[PDB]
Amino acid sequence: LSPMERFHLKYLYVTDLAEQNWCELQTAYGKELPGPVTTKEDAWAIKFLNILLLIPTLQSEGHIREFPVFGEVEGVLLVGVIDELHYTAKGELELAELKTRRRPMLPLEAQKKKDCFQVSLYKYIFDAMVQGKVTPASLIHHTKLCLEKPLGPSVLRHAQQGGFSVKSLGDLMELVFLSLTLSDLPVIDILKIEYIHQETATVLGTEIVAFKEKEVRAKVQHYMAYWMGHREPQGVDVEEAWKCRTCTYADICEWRKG
Ligand code: SF4
Ligand SMILES: [Mg+2]
């Protein structure tokens, strides 16, 4: 029985893989020992209507926030939300992820590696979306969305308020696929992480992620291999054994003992 089946998971979040970069075993324990008026058809419809509104905003106002992303990645559906997207002064599409720290210390290199992998996943999924690699069939196969169930009045409220007339959920998805791929949306050019002190608003550092598609794909194939149940989960390396000093599951983790 695969972890996705054991933990009753049908898709994953981008942060689930980011926390998996910190420790795969700690992430596994987090899903095993954790510590309805709307419908999944309605929730995804709201996500689609947000996209249909954000695409022209980014292409006209040049700046958007909270852009949802999704797509099948190595047999697993990965879902995420981009903090910020905007065109630079040179016409480059830049992604911004803001990290606030309560203490004014520089971020750990292990924290930077985890954050670099999170935004690399954002570009990985976003680029696949605007280039026509994410179909409505792949989402329906993974989310079990029933297309003939009519959308609840909460969504038609959220919709016609913006002027658009929705048909069924299937027609809503086909317009999203059209608007993602045929509206001249480019690939994300710049991946930018910014670390800020919460109080004094001091810049604690700024990373510009050097995106390499082959390395990103290889790391994803390795991580998704565990979730599909093809290999045992791994703990942290010995040089990063300090991660278990504060790990919730350090008292029953037999990797830290072995
Ligand atoms: S104790 Fe260390 S190796 Fe074990 S789950 Fe926690 S962080 Fe991972
Ligand atoms: Mg964010």
From Swiss-Prot:
Q: Which GO terms describe its cellular component?
A: cytosol; nucleoplasm; nucleus
Principal localization reads: nucleus
Q: How is the cofactor bound?
A: Binds 1 [4Fe-4S] cluster.
GO terms for MF: 4 iron, 4 sulfur cluster binding; DNA binding; metal ion binding; single-stranded DNA 3'-5' DNA exonuclease activity; single-stranded DNA 5'-3' DNA exonuclease activity
**GO process terms (BP):** interstrand cross-link repair
Where is [4Fe-4S] cluster bound in this sequence? Answer: 23, 244, 247, 253
Q: Does the keyword Ligase apply?
A: no
The enzyme's E.C. designation:
3.1.-.-
Binding of Mg(2+) occurs at 83, 97
Q: Give the protein's cofactors.
A: [4Fe-4S] cluster; Mg(2+)
Q: Indicate where this protein resides in the cell.
A: Nucleus; Cytoplasm, Cytosol
Keyword Cytoplasm annotated: yes
Q: Which UniProt keywords apply?
A: 4Fe-4S, Cytoplasm, DNA damage, DNA repair, DNA-binding, Exonuclease, Hydrolase, Iron, Iron-sulfur, Magnesium, Metal-binding, Nuclease, Nucleus
**Self-association and partners:** Monomer; monomeric form has weak exonuclease activity. Homodimer; homodimeric form is unsure but has much higher exonuclease activity, suggesting that it could homodimerize upon DNA-binding. Interacts with the replication protein A (RPA) complex.
Protein name from the UniProt record = Exonuclease V
Q: Which organism is it from?
A: Homo sapiens
Q: Which residues of the full protein are shown?
A: 70 to 357 of 373
